[PDB]
């Protein structure tokens, strides 16, 4: 065969699709809804409630926009470095890095523009009394799950031969 080093076209489409979907949903919630309003999509399981977060996960480190600014630039540059140096010929890793990149960039735009993050996903399917999050948060969590899956799987991949 002819194996490929960088699935760059797929990785860009993935990141572009997530950031567009994240920014549009954030905009229409902040435009067509007041804070505290709640709409019902799946009763008792999923609602859309306008919410604002000036901090990180679970509202930790609230009001530290300079810290979020620096640490997100470090993350974005680190993801680009690992894409080129350690993820070549690995489509699974390149997809996970793109989801991490899109998620970090999505929340980074909100903090730079407004100094806070719009959150509207209000559900209990992934656990009860779970904080209200957004699409950028979902992409981040998803990419982290794939990263730990790939590396945990390769702990059991130490087998000498590669051909029958
Ligand atoms: C999830 C990415 C968090 C995201 O970090 C970001 O921005 C990126 C750029 C990096 C941060 C600046 C650095 C913090 C370290 C990560 C952290 O904090 C602990 C890790 C727990 C987490 C990962 C395994 C699982 C569960 C959390 C949540 C559930 O996610 C579905 C939180 C959803 C609601 O708290 C919602 O209000 C959050 C709000 O939207 C702002 N978003 C952020 O801060
Ligand atoms: C989220 C899904 C985003 C859509 C990502 C799929 C794009 C794609 O796979 O296109 C591959 C094609 O070969 C172009 O390089
Ligand atoms: C999650 C989205 C899954 C992305 C898969 C896209 C894909 O399969 O692209 C193949 C590539 O274009 C050729 O090998
Ligand atoms: C970020 C996306 C920038 C476009 C991708 C790119 O830089 O293309 C690499 C080119 O092939 C280098 O020779
Ligand atoms: C909150 C997360 C903050 C920073 C994560 C950034 C992680 C950056 C880790 C850099 C370590 C590194 O690059 O090591 C080189 C490696 O050995 C070459 O393959
Ligand atoms: C919580 C934020 C994530 C914790 C820091 C990520 C761990 C990390 O930096 O990984 C480096 C990479 O694995 C080097 O090969
Ligand atoms: C938790 C939500 C906040 C977001 C925090 C994101 C921080 C992640 C930073 C870099 C990840 C880059 C992943 C690079 C994966 C490649 C690992 C690798 O190749 O290392 C091989 C080594 O030999 C095996 O130990
Ligand atoms: C979910 C959709 C899965 C699509 C995966 C396609 C794919 O992985 O392409 C293989 C590549 O050509 C070689 O690694
Ligand atoms: C938003 C735009 C790009 C996000 C892409 C995020 C995934 C990081 C891709 C890193 C990259 O640019 O790869 C260049 C490589 O040289 C290719 O040939
Ligand atoms: Zn009912
Ligand atoms: Zn909050």
Residue numbers in the entry: -1, 1 to 163
Give verbatim excerpts from the published study on this entry.
The pathway in Gram-negative bacteria employs the prolipoprotein diacylglyceryl transferase, Lgt, to dagylate the pre-prolipoprotein, LspA to cleave off the signal peptide from the proliprotein and the apolipoprotein N-acyltransferase, Lnt, to perform a final N-acylation step. The enzyme consists of four transmembrane helices (H1-H4) with the catalytic dyad aspartates, Asp118 and Asp136, towards the membrane’s outer surface. Extending away from the catalytic dyad and to one side of the bundle of transmembrane helices is the β-cradle, a hemi-cylindrically shaped sheet that sits on the membrane.
However, when combined with LspMrs, crystals and a structure of the complex to 2.30 Å resolution were obtained by the in meso method using monoolein as the host lipid. Overall, the structure of the protein in the myxovirescin complex is very similar to that of the complex with globomycin. Differences were noted at the C-terminus that was fully formed as an extended helix in the myxovirescin complex but was disordered, and without useful electron density in the globomycin complex. By contrast, myxovirescin binds with its macrocycle docked on the left side of the pocket with the EL extended out and over the ring. However, despite this marked difference in docking mode and approach to the active site, the 6-OH of myxovirescin wedges firmly between the two catalytic aspartates inhibiting the enzyme, just like globomycin, as a non-cleavable tetrahedral intermediate analog. Indeed, the 6-OH of myxovirescin and the β-OH of g.Ser, hereafter referred to as blocking hydroxyls, superpose to within 0.8 Å in the two complex structures. The similarities do not end there. Tracking along the myxovirescin molecule from the 6-OH to the [-4NH-3C(O)-] amide linkage we find the latter hydrogen bonded to the catalytic Asp136 and to Arg110. In the myxovirescin complex, the loop has unfolded fully and extends deeper into the substrate-binding pocket enabling the benzene ring of Trp57 to contact the macrocycle locking it in position against the opposite side of the pocket surface. By contrast, in complex with LspMrs, myxovirescin assumes the shape of an ovaloid disc bent at its broad end.
